[PDB]
């Protein structure tokens, strides 16, 4: 089997993308933010307390003939913005682009922290890394993936985000129409649970490229681009007045700034992120400052390679024996 569903910016920053995912029977259809960077399906639902559900869509288990709760069974998660939901779970049919899994663990939340409240475009979450960083107490549960994986024609998925367009995530099957060139396979290390590999170096803009590993992992729910605080300097330091704010958060600059390109390494080949990638805009309303695609890792712990990286790049998150990531131009 394969499934393709198109996935499309929440907003005109790209700050996430929502993919319709239809739950239960008859179908209810809610749209979740797919997220190779955690390992929980979750939505709002019939069970979300009502003063933090605002304009999303829930996913009602009563209303499913074949939803099933899965007795005892919580969860509960933490994201690397600080943001958390809680909950129980049901099991039910889940279909994504077409591809269906019955007997799918269904994350009903219960508790939503205050950004989930404030986006009403994100019904919830789709997770995408490996199913032992999945929260489910007191049996783990496997994710959409992992479920669907024997079935696949081959055993995949891929992650064309588009930069202000939608794009298309595939599962089982690898589109050839999709990139240019040739897709490049890097090694995979899964002991931390996610996608985690290793870039051979970078450059800015026209500059030579540097050789130097930089692990970090490839991660759809994660808006910008973390690396480690020498590579973002370098990058910075060639827009005229681009400066680290500890009151913004990270690096701003000015909004009249024509940003450079970027340039991460795959092996021996290069993906590049034209530099208009990396402006995510006023850090307030009609302010001229901006807040930059690029921004440190040192306060995170792992460098991450997200949507700002991704969507310059068709994606192959290989989910053989031994998982392997694969990256195209496009």
Same mark, same amino acid.
């Given at each position: 089997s394969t499934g393709s569903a198109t996935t499309t910016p929440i907003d005109s920053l790209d700050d996430a993308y929502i993919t319709p995912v239809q739950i239960g029977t008859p179908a209810q259809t809610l749209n979740l933010?797919?997220? *190779?960077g955690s390992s929980d399906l979750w939505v709002f639902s019939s069970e979300t307390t009502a003063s933090e559900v605002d304009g999303q869509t829930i996913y009602t288990? $009563?209303?499913? !003939? !074949?939803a099933k709760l899965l007795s005892g069974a919580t969860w509960s998660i933490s994201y690397g913005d600080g943001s958390s939901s809680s909950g129980d779970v049901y099991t039910d049919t889940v279909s994504v682009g077409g591809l269906t899994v019955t007997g799918q663990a269904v994350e009903s939340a219960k508790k939503v922290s205050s950004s989930f409240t404030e %986006? $009403? *475009?994100?019904?919830g979450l789709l997770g995408l890394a490996?199913? !032992?960083?999945? &929260?489910?107490?007191?049996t783990q549960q496997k994710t959409f993936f992992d479920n669907a994986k024997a079935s696949l024609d081959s055993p995949v998925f891929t992650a064309d985000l588009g930069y202000h367009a939608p794009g298309t995530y595939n599962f089982g099957?690898? %589109? *050839? &129409?999709?990139? !240019?060139?040739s897709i490049t396979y890097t090694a995979v290390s899964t002991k931390q649970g996610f996608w985690e590999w290793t870039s051979t170096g970078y450059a800015v803009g026209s500059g030579t490229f540097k050789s130097t590993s930089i692990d970090g992992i490839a991660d759809t729910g994660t808006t910008l681009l973390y690396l480690p605080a020498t590579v973002v300097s370098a990058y910075w330091?060639?827009?005229?007045?681009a400066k680290s704010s500890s009151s913004v958060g990270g690096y701003v600059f000015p909004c009249s700034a024509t940003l450079p390109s970027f340039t991460f390494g795959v092996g021996s080949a290069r993906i590049v992120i034209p530099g208009d990638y990396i402006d995510f805009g006023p850090? $307030? &309303?009609?302010?001229?400052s901006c807040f930059g695609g690029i921004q440190s890792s040192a306060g995170i712990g792992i460098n991450i390679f997200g949507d700002v990286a991704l969507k310059a790049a068709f994606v192959v998150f290989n989910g053989a024996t031994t998982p392997t990531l694969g990256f195209a131009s496009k």
């Open positions: 933010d797919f997220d *190779t288990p $009563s209303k499913s !003939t !074949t %986006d $009403s *475009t994100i019904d490996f199913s !032992t960083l999945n &929260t489910v107490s007191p099957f690898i %589109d *050839t &129409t999709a990139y !240019t060139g330091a060639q827009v005229s007045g850090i $307030s &309303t009609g302010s001229s």
